[PDB]
């Protein structure tokens, strides 16, 4: 339908004095298209782009902002520079809505240098603390890549986790744990306490139940001793739910040739 080479020259035209928000938006779309189907990439081309993209920033226009994020987001493992961005970044951060902020972290995370990190940590603290989960959620994912990169220092942060540990959004409830597990999973022990930690606890954005299941079993699995008092507690609960899947989840695992307790399983089953 359409072709890259011409476009590659032409994109900079938005960068040419040209005012017509639409035009450029479209052109950007195409680039992304070229890209989406599959595209070579490289530096020179990038660098030239680096000056090109950069001037264009008296835009207020929110949507305009969106577009940017995406593009930048494109550059990550093959990323080029950050300092410019800092100011920019800062701008999202101070930036009123919430929104702006999430995209930026998101590009950042495969790509970056230890160093700055410290600074940006503070920002993290803030994200960590904010009530509109979303951004906070946005924050989290980045970290993972940062874990890719590393994430250990991220570890240091466990504390924040705790302050966070109080949660009330379901999905969100879910997200926290995922991290956590990773964290403690390098560690049996705590977890044992964790269990306890949840033990007082039920779960908000369920999903949480489920990872935990795999988990809850996963210690037990090796013979994290007592199925009996703990496991079972879990099970009645598990059993009970209309989170039929959860019930299942337990059910599926317990595949026991003699029937560990053959009986009950059959009800669950009937139900199945």
């Amino acid at each position: 339908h359409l072709e890259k080479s011409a476009v590659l020259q032409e994109a900079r035209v938005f960068n040419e004095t040209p005012i017509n928000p639409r035009k450029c938006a479209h052109i950007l779309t195409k680039i992304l298209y070229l890209i989406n189907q599959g595209e070579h990439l490289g530096t020179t081309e990038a660098t030239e782009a680096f000056f090109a993209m950069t001037k264009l920033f008296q835009s207020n226009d929110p949507t305009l902002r969106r577009m940017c994020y995406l593009t930048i987001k494109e550059m990550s493992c093959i990323a080029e520079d950050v300092i410019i961005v800092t100011s920019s970044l800062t701008k999202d951060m101070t930036g009123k809505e919430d929104n702006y902020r999430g995209p930026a972290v998101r590009a950042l995370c495969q790509i970056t240098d230890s160093t700055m990190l410290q600074a940006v940590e503070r920002y993290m603290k803030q994200a960590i603390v904010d009530k509109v989960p979303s951004v906070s959620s946005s924050a989290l994912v980045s970290s993972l890549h940062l874990l890719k990169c590393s994430f250990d220092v991220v570890k240091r942060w466990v504390n924040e986790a705790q302050e966070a540990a109080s949660s009330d959004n379901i999905m969100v409830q879910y997200h926290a744990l995922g991290l956590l597990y990773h964290v403690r999973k390098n560690d049996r022990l705590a977890v044992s306490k964790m269990i306890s930690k949840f033990t007082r606890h039920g779960l908000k954005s369920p999903f949480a139940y489920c990872m935990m299941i795999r988990v809850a079993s996963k210690q037990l699995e090796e013979e994290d001793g007592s199925r009996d008092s703990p496991l079972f507690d879990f099970i009645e609960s598990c059993l009970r739910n209309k989170h039929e899947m959860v019930v299942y989840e337990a059910a599926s695992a317990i595949v026991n040739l003699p029937g560990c307790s053959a009986k009950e399983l059959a009800p669950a089953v009937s139900v199945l």
Binding site: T94, K155, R156, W157, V158, N159, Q162, E163, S166, D187, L189, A190, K193
Partner: protein, 604 residues
């Protein structure tokens, strides 16, 4: 999380609406201004009046101590400034600065200044070295100047609060603020600063019951807080702990954690409204004026949690409220007794639970640490959680292999390796529990002795103490009991027989167990077993060891402190503050021993 914490009703007075309070640090004196019109200065410590002054008899709004200056500053709403040299209370000077109701003074400490805000919609600066010049006048008002606070951090820059709801922060080169921001939706009663230099917050007060946090460097309202029960007369930064003090127009205390931001607690001294507050900069004691009176409370621990391996690493955790993330210290070098030393750097940890106990395993090794009321024990080198649970009270089985617990009921269960030890299971009235070699249950203003395998009331002695330290091998044991102190022998054989015979006294315990050797009437800052030697601190700050019928002071210490640790090999004592400079004084254990043995007739 719990109030297993220091709250002390430090000092009380019931009085009037004590509007203002101002602190004398340099000697912990406090100045208070009343709605009576009389102002008084007290030494709280013994509830004693340092001086009182009738400055005016009109309510006296503002007060300062000028410590550097050695004089005390006062103003009443005769619109005059009266000066005393506090070095009597001899009154130096008077003059009329601000001609309207003078609300607040903020002072530059570094630089010789007194800043004032007054209701005249004026802020004037006056220079004391110039002998109360009105050096400069700061204006940019819209109403009475209700409050001035100096950002003392940058003394130099300061912030102003008015109830027309706005805040001007100023630069000297702005006898006007640099800017005004439109804070309140009420009025900005108050402006306050964030203790740390590192980051920057203000809290400002309103009775609207909404709190906004601001970061100056960005220049944002960081966030805005809600939850409240009644018009917050005041809310304050805890400078010691990260907590938020909230205060009300009814004198309600609510605390939100300045980290949890969860209501940690509400307290009622319904002494009505928060008129003033002033805080210890040492961040621990604070006073507020209320109507029915005022109350001052004392809120601190005296230590971090650390325990030292005799290689020479006192591993502590935290610093004061810093993460636990910081333990280590094997050092590497040597220097003179008086002179000071260097540390290593490699944190481990970054716990969450906030402790107040550290205790080593008996081989240093396993520490059990309690905090938030539960016990994390660490595998230390491991940095592993050795284990956890919730406490109430504790004894390691001294041996280094079991432990006991007092459940937040009060009835004993003990665990050795997570096995309850029921061979021993009195559960009598207690007070506290003591482990060691020989079991103490402190009960019924008595201290009662128990076996280690079955309980036995071995003995009961007269009263209760506070603390026990046992000699090392247990043998002669040292119990700290206020002023007074005792040293004892425990004699085994009797028991063995007696036990065999069975028929005994145990109300008293059995009078055929222990003997009372001698007692020193003693006050202990910190204290030590060197073996069975009691090497001790006194809180009178002499470090003495009771030796030979003698108590000798090896040395006397600044003021008294904490016993770093004497790594015997080195024969030295490492002395420890709480501010992480270690001093060492060598002894030589042998000398003591030499003495010990010879008296024993081990002359050779």
């Amino acid at each position: 999380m719990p109030l297993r914490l220091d709250i002390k009703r430090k000092l009380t007075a019931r009085s009037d609406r004590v509007k203002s309070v101002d602190l004398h640090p340099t000697e912990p004196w406090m100045l208070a201004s009343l709605y009576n019109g009389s102002v008084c200065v007290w030494n709280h410590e013994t509830q004693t009046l340092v001086k009182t002054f009738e400055v005016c008899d009109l309510p006296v709004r503002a007060a300062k101590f000028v410590a550097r200056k050695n004089w005390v500053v006062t103003g009443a709403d005769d619109m005059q400034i009266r000066v005393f040299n506090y070095n009597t209370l001899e009154r130096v000077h008077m003059f009329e600065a601000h001609s309207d109701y003078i609300r607040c003074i903020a002072v530059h400490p570094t630089q010789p200044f007194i800043l004032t805000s007054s209701d005249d919609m004026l802020i004037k600066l006056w220079d004391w070295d110039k002998k109360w010049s009105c050096s400069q006048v700061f204006e940019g008002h819209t109403h009475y100047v209700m409050q001035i606070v100096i950002n003392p951090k940058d003394n130099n820059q300061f912030a102003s609060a008015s109830l027309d709801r706005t805040i001007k922060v100023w630069q000297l080169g702005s006898s006007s603020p640099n800017f005004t921001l439109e804070g309140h939706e009420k009025g900005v009663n108050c402006i306050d600063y964030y203790s740390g230099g590192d980051k920057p917050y203000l809290i400002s007060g309103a009775d609207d019951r909404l709190v906004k946090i601001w970061d100056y460097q960005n220049k944002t309202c960081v966030q805005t807080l809600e939850g409240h029960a009644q018009n917050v007369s005041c809310a304050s930064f805890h400078p010691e702990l990260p907590i938020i003090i909230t205060g009300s127009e009814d004198g309600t205390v609510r605390i939100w954690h300045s980290s949890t931001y969860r209501l940690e607690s509400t307290l009622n001294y319904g002494m009505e409204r928060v008129w003033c507050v002033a805080s210890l900069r040492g961040s621990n004691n604070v006073a507020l004026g209320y109507d029915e009176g005022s109350i001052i409370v004392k809120l601190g621990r005296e230590e971090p949690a650390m325990s030292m391996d005799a290689n020479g690493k006192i591993i502590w955790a935290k610093h004061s409220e810093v993460q636990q993330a910081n333990l280590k210290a094997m050092g590497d070098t040597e220097i003179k007794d008086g002179e000071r030393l260097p540390l290593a750097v490699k944190d481990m940890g970054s716990c969450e639970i906030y402790p107040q106990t550290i205790q080593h395993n008996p081989n240093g090794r396993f520490v059990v640490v309690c905090g938030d009321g539960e016990y994390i024990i660490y595998t230390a080198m491991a940095l592993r959680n050795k284990s956890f649970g919730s406490a109430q009270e504790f004894a390691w089985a001294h041996d280094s292999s079991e432990y006991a617990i007092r459940e937040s009921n009060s009835i004993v269960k003990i665990f050795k390796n997570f096995k309850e030890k029921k061979s021993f299971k009195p559960d009598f009235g207690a007070e506290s529990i003591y482990g060691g070699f020989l079991l103490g249950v402190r009960s019924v203003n008595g201290l009662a002795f128990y076996d280690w395998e079955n309980t036995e009331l071995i003995r009961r002695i007269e009263i209760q103490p506070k603390h026990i330290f046992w000699s090392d091998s247990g043998e002669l044991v040292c119990i700290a009991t206020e002023e007074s102190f005792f040293i004892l022998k425990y004699l085994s054989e009797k028991v063995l027989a007696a036990q065999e015979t069975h028929e005994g006294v145990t109300e008293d315990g059995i009078e055929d167990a222990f003997e009372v050797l001698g007692e020193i009437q003693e006050i202990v800052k910190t204290g030590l077993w060197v073996g069975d030697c009691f090497i001790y601190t006194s809180s009178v700050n002499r470090l003495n060891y009771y030796v030979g019928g003698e108590i000798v002071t090896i040395a006397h210490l600044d003021r008294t402190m904490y016993l770093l640790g004497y790594i015997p090999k080195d024969n030295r004592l490492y002395l420890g503050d709480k501010e992480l400079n270690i001093v060492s004084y060598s002894l030589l254990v042998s000398v003591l021993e030499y003495q010990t043995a010879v008296m024993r007739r081990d002359f050779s």
